[PDB]
Write a protein that binds this ligand. Sequence first.
Ligand code: ZXM
Length: 360
Amino acid sequence: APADRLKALVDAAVQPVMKANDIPGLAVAISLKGEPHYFSYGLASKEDGRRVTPETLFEIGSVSKTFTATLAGYALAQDKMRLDDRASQHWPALQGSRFDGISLLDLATYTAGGLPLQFPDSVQKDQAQIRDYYRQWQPTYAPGSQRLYSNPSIGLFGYLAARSLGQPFERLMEQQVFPALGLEQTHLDVPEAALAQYAQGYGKDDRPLRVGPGPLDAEGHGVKTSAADLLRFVDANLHPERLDRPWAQALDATHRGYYKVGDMTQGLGWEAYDWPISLKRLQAGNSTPMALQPHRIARLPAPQALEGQRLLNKTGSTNGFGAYVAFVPGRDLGLVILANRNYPNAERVKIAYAILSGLE
Ligand SMILES: *[B]([O])([O])[C]([C]N1[C]=C(C([O])=O)N=N1)[N]C(=O)[C]C1=[C][C]=[C]S1
């Protein structure tokens, strides 16, 4: 039976990796030719024995950047900003700073000139500290030349997209983006009524961890969602034409590549590969050196449509959680893997590759 074959494929991909990485709980959701399939493993909380289900809420860390990119896509569709706008055109506090010379595209795609992975520890979640951090920041190298994966970079992109729409980022996401995408189990700030669904995270020590407040955390890494809601967002990405037209345009804006580093083409949020490609190459594109070191970009002469024979993906983590999303536009195939351990990207990609190769 096809259902027995699917469950055997997903079990064989997931179970050894959960054992090898001591993952307490893991949710898979698959979209295959317009039908969803769910597989749930292990414990949302080791302490209280709550099992993972497709409704369990996980922190998805940097997968949040695809939601940030979608809000920016909506600002672009509404003609409220353009990617070649200078960042200081959207925040007067930045006028006179080096953000006079940095584009929204540079911020979105991590090419502003060396904004670091994280805000420094000296910058708390405080509007004045964030403002002052950007006012004083000076590039290490020319804007537009080198990719250095960065929360302050795409965080400021999201913040400025929200300013272009005249409302706070968190409010726009809750009141406009999540409803437009049909997401009722997706949160920046989990309601008290929903906490029973919120999995516990387990740190590299095996200590308990849900994410603490940080500067521009909503824009960079703040989403909590279920495997079922995150697959609804994958299905929106696979079929933008099913949404009302402004939101279809917003999703299309996240499917445009601006430059290549190795095998990876960088979009807004999404990172793309040719498909098929080897597992080792997909792991290398999602490697620690790709995330932590600067890489010279190969700029495309015009944006490339991220569609057809391609895999679009994003990794995301917090101290206690590890998420991965991948989809293949030309095959109507999508995958979500949510776990309550920050386990290596390479292992997330190994599960995903086994499943996507077996769906074929
Ligand atoms: B994201 O998920 O890419 C982003 C950056 N990041 C850091 C790590 C890591 O150290 O393993 N993984 N991803 N996520 C965040 O900045 C949120 C946090 C990462 C660890 C604690 S908070």
